[PDB]
């Protein structure tokens, strides 16, 4: 918690969510997208609308959000607000 508190403070000291998270502007952000269908809620034939419950798994790399675990008590993974 103290280690994670220090880490979270360090990572977002000068972070920007405006620009793409790349170390060079010519680099392309590569996102792996995977859909999980939990429930088929409805199929409205009159209005031609299908309602579904889904999870939209998205995986990418932020090159400004790396750290060495040894410098932060061995913390290897965290959960942060999106």
């Amino acid at each position, epitope marked *: 918690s103290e280690h994670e508190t220090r880490l979270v403070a360090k990572l977002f000291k000068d972070y920007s969510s405006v620009v793409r998270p790349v*170390e*060079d502007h*010519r*680099q*392309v952000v*590569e*996102v*792996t997208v*995977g859909l999980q269908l939990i429930q088929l809620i409805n199929v409205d034939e009159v209005n031609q609308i299908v309602t579904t419950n889904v999870r939209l798994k998205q*995986q*990418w*790399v932020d090159y400004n959000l*790396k*750290w*060495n675990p040894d*410098d932060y008590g061995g913390v*290897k*993974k965290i959960h942060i607000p999106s």
Partner: antibody
Amino acid sequence: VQLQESGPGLVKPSETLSLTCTLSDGSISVSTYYWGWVRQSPEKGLEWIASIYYTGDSYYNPSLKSRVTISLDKSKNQFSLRLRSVTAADTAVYFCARDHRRSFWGSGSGYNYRY
Amino acid sequence: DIQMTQSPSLLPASVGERVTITCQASQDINNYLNWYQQKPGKAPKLLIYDASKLETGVPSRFSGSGSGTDFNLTISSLQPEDFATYYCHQYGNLPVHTFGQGTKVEIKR
């Protein structure tokens, strides 16, 4: 978050050396990574064996391409190496590694890559 | 194909010294070169990528430089935990890799 190798520590000559790398806290189906094998020996230093993509594309060291089969398993989040016709020259420390691929855009050429 | 020659095979040095390891490529590879450090009984660790960029969490003592053919890994002030075996690694546009021979840094006396 971690990679773990597993396989026999001793192989008889001419048999097939089988190794399996398992991912801990991660998925093998990621577009930005290849999954590869690199061996280290006192006499040869580090030597890359092969790499595989999650879609199945494989790339091999030209010297070892004939004897090497790199394979994938998405259900178990594993990737394995099978080196055939193994002899005494193959004694080494085998590491499984993640080849981090960065994509770059060239005007008129498209995607180019670094590792 | 591309072959990498790393020199010296052995670099004795003391704490505070400035040391330089060299890697020579047979062909022109631009800056498609990375550097790795390996302590005894441990996996290699990435230090520099693209031949001049420092990976996050690496001390500023390490620097890399070079263009096609000739490349360099410099340590400005050698410290007790920088004694290890250093490797140059070459890659292409495809995941085909060639590791240079190791260079060991040992204690001088």
